[PDB]
Symmetry: C3
Subunit: 87 residues, 3 copies
């Protein structure tokens, strides 16, 4: 099957669901209305996620695994960038 990971924040709430499918991770988003496709699109067969609020600003870390290599992807409001995580 496809593999998913989920995070949420606040009380509305905001939800982000990540799906690993055919070597690619994509993102679906809800913020109190309908679902929409998120900006996140990077390779992976396995995915985990965690998020935290710095005041009103959400920060997301997505851990994308292909073989024995896990790449950390960072959302800090402006774009998805590679993090310094190593195994």
């Amino acid at each position: 099957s496809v593999q998913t990971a989920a995070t949420s924040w606040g009380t509305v709430p905001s939800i982000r669901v990540y799906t690993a499918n055919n070597g690619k991770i994509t993102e679906r988003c809800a913020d109190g209305k309908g679902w929409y496709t998120g900006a996140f699109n990077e390779p992976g067969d396995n995915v985990s996620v965690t998020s935290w609020l710095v005041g009103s600003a959400i920060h997301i870390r997505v851990y994308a695994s292909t073989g024995t290599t896990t790449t950390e992807w960072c959302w800090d409001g402006n774009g998805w960038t590679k993090g310094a995580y190593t195994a």
Copy 2:
């Protein structure tokens, strides 16, 4: 090969929910500050993820159950498990 689990918790007691995908079936184990018991959640799936949030003292849980390329969202809001609006 092995079962696949997802976990969420809330408050300081705490309350914990663990979801296990086992040979195409997802079941739920629960702790609320005593022992473990089997929860009301039972739906098909080979893969499960979960998130939860509090509105005051009221827990809201979203479980994402996947079979092949089809992900179904299940919603706990205090009364029972309902299918959610999630699509992909």
Copy 3:
């Protein structure tokens, strides 16, 4: 492919990433000044994690699965101990 589970707490933040690799689950840690190897080391092919704060004290529960047997490991400030979880 390796399988990961991620949790975070606070606003720095603190992040823990658990990786199941060839029947071994290991832990990588970030507390605001780089990644280091954590004290968690247990057998398993699948891992999930949840954590919560009681005031300023962090508690972690890691669910490690081999076949159909899931073992819960507990961090409560001092060390990793066997939890009461069964299925």
